[PDB]
Symmetry: C5
Subunit: 213 residues, 5 copies
């Protein structure tokens, strides 16, 4: 109930409940099925681009959602959501397979837990990537691909799925960048390796962008 | 009362009281209202500016205040204020929406808690931003807008109070900067997204500056 | 077995068992044999190569395995593997002898523990090294050698061993790199110092690579 | 007693006593008087001087002393002093008001606690400052002022005091630096803001320095 | 007993014993004498030198030993040594007095404790220093001196002693520089402000650029 959002004792009790039930290191699989993790990158800035080394330096908001129904509660007379330090929650062990620098989180490491068990997590991340920068100076642009998946959980445990397939992130991308976004595509993809018998799901984010004229 | 400020045992007891009552992870909402957080930036320096990439590197003191009256105490015969490590307190989850680097905090991470429950927190922060640098070499200067608000709390939980005086800006800005500040103004705005209907309040700080 | 992989309570119980049994600071010697640690570097990116200083800056996935049978469980009707934060596990104290920067871990610090007690750990690491960079711009390329072993455990305690002797690394290396790999060889190597009595059993990784034409 | 300095059990017991008594988060005010903190910067090196941005990058040892008589013990037959991790102690919340980088501490974060309750703390700090760099290439040199006080305690709570106003720092400054120090002056200074009531004390450190071999062909 | 080195329970038990006895924050002064700390720097690389600013950036293995007999155990039928996280141990508060950057430790922070109570600690450290780089491009080379001693313990509490080489087993063959000589000598430091003497090791790194181009 929105009207109870500012009831501090309710918020405290919800946080307590969440911390009692939460298993931060155990995947929250329900009904013996993979955890469905929804991922969408919203690019904010393209800071540096190197056509020689095929590297980009970018900032994006990583819109991330999943469900853990064990966290649910009846919010008929209490806040429908609270903010929770992610140290109290399981968070998917996502990583970009072509990152060449640490993900630098620029934002408070908090998630929102919804009373129906949904968890919303959106770090702003600055990170560098190895990807195809060729054509950045042309009108058709470069198409830089970023692959994001679970670092240790295979497809039977975690499914990593794109939320939206297409956008030019108009609400998000800085108008002040020297680059402009032509199109952002996000599709599912499965990866396997000769060493290991299982498949790993990821989202392939295709960033089509060019230098402004 | 100020006469009792240096009573050490009193200070220790106040710190104990604050730590027993404090909920560092819960917003301190009082009487069915959002936490009103006052935020004003006092710019100290402009260090690097890039008109090609539209990026600025600045240092500011982030004046931050809010109330948590559950922290209040009777100070008739005890200190009026104490310093408290912010790890012992709830602090607003503010973030700069157009920051392109982590906020580098240059100062001890302590706040003051006043006996009426007011909390004062003022980190000196160095941070880089993406903003409009065009006009920095002209006499009308550039206007770089920095937007700061809660990262996870919407308007019914945290409201931002942007109201501040700016006639004292020269007490703060370094005389040895390569840049000069012409004007600083702040206004409230609201931020919403297609995906997400709740409104998030922010303060837009318009920094109007130019190369000396 | 895989049909019980998503039994959350089972996973939680296995994580509990591992944490009860694990001794993170004690080498998992079994019988009276050294711990056999298998190491293979899968190169992802060669980012900087410095002609003059003989330095390279690389990203690699450090495939690392060893066994601790005390961690084993019956997975007839339970998950075959779980992810475990490495803070809960003993991990080999590996270091590159010719590293000239800290290993920067780019990925979640989790390992897999298998029900037969095998541990699988593979951080993505960015690190700089001092090695022979001569020939990088030639057909035959440069051969940069990286020596990896236990920092404090000698050969009676830990053996650091190669998995495969040669690798094409084609499933791993970035196709957008400005370099390409001719061969990666990884061989056993023993090191002694005149100051000190014991031998240290390490893996010598020879990265034969060149700038793309 | 100097003869008992190396009695390990005594040192352990002193460290235990200190940890039992210490309130790391509470100012050690005595007699309703402000804590007197003595600060003296001994410059070790001037790493970089940017004439375009008016910035210096320096290394200094921050000689810091104060007392907490609650920590005192009878050293008639026990060590005079011990080293203590500063995480076990209250330490003044000092900040440089014109710093433009974090203070990077190059030394183990230990203090000495003396049996009379004196605390001695001296980190080696590398840090960047915004200050007047003009004149660095002249004979009279540049004068870069660094202002250091408590970040959150006003003058009734902490007073910050220079140990000594004038030195050339001969025992400390590297002979291999590109620069040379003419004089370091450190004076008391009081800071107030029209926004806020009380006064904050600080030490104003004026670093008078110049480039070696300022005279060039071209 | 080396035959028992890999007895896991024995190792776990030794680790337990060490952690029960260890006082990580108290100097292990035995018999009212200062702790004798042995230090030898084995240089691995010289990464950058600047003859204008007189600064060097180097990597070295800091061979460090001292003893704490209270840690000693009977190894007749148990391991001779175990590795121990240094967070469980007292370690000397060493610092380089002319360092101009933080010591960057490149290696797992473990020490070996020997059953006679000897502790061996050897971090690989990357660090920058202010020292004399003049002469680096010449035959004679430069001689960069690095002073390392206790940051807070004077000579009555800690003595820091050198254990004379060109570091051939350690220095990188692929460095741009080459080492002519490394000497390490005892040294004593005092200040006007302060009575006590502080012991340090003064390390002299005599090195030069490889394959110089000179005017003959
Ligand atoms: N565009 C957007 N997307 C998501 C989101 C998240 C998952 S799917 C979609 C969440 C979100 N906000 C709520 C939120 C929840 C959790 C963490 C951070 N923020 C609003 C908002 C406004 C301004 C600064 C930051 N956030 N905003
Ligand atoms: N200009 C200014 N603004 C605020 C403030 C805070 C919120 S609204 C306004 C507080 C403040 N001081 C008290 C204080 C409280 C908390 C943290 C840090 N400082 C005095 C002062 C003096 C010199 C260095 C630093 N501070 N000074
Ligand atoms: N190529 C590959 N090798 C190993 C491996 C490990 C030891 S020997 C061989 C493990 C592994 N995965 C499982 C795993 C377990 C532990 C840590 C990290 N990853 C799948 C995978 C897929 C894509 C990104 C990362 N991981 N993938
Ligand atoms: N020059 C100097 N000044 C002070 C000092 C301190 C406060 S007022 C004056 C203390 C001090 N030493 C003792 C000490 C105590 C605490 C922390 C660090 N060191 C000797 C010394 C020698 C060489 C390296 C480091 N220290 N040396
Ligand atoms: N050359 C050398 N010196 C010492 C040493 C130490 C004190 S006096 C002499 C110790 C040592 N090793 C044992 C050891 C113990 C503690 C920490 C690290 N290493 C072998 C070794 C081999 C290769 C990489 C690393 N270590 N190696
Ligand atoms: C939640 O509580 C309300 C009573 O306030 C009740 O009407 C409703 O059925 C409850 N929901 C569930 C799922 O039990
Ligand atoms: C506070 O304490 C004083 C004396 O200790 C008393 O006079 C007063 O009534 C108390 N309450 C308030 C609100 O001042
Ligand atoms: C493993 O298999 C089943 C588990 O259901 C059980 O009968 C048996 O005791 C287990 N243990 C071993 C050693 O096989
Ligand atoms: C300290 O203790 C000694 C005995 O060990 C005694 O002679 C002396 O009077 C004591 N001093 C104080 C100040 O208590
Ligand atoms: C050590 O233990 C052995 C038995 O394990 C015993 O014979 C011996 O007396 C003990 N003491 C020494 C100093 O070896």
């Amino acid at each position: 109930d929105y009207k109870d959002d500012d009831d501090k004792l309710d918020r405290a009790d919800i946080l307590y409940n969440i911390r009692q039930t939460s298993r931060p290191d155990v995947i929250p699989t329900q009904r013996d099925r993979p955890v469905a993790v929804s991922v969408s990158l919203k690019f904010i800035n393209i800071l540096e681009v190197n056509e020689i080394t095929n590297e980009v330096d970018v900032v994006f908001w990583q819109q991330t959602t999943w469900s853990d129904r064990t966290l649910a509660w009846n919010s008929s007379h209490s806040p429908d959501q609270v903010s929770v330090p992610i140290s109290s929650l399981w968070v998917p062990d996502l990583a970009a397979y072509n990152a060449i620098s640490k993900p630098e989180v620029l934002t408070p490491q908090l998630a929102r837990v919804v009373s129906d068990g949904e968890v919303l997590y959106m770090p702003s991340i600055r990170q560098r990537f190895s990807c195809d920068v060729s054509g950045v100076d042309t009108e058709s642009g470069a198409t830089c691909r970023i692959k994001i998946g679970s670092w240790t959980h295979h497809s039977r445990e975690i499914s990593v799925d794109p939320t939206t397939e297409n956008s030019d992130d108009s609400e998000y991308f800085s108008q002040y960048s020297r680059f402009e976004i032509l199109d952002v595509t996000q599709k599912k993809n499965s990866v396997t390796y000769s060493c290991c018998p299982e498949a790993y799901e990821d989202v392939e984010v295709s960033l089509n962008f060019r230098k402004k004229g």
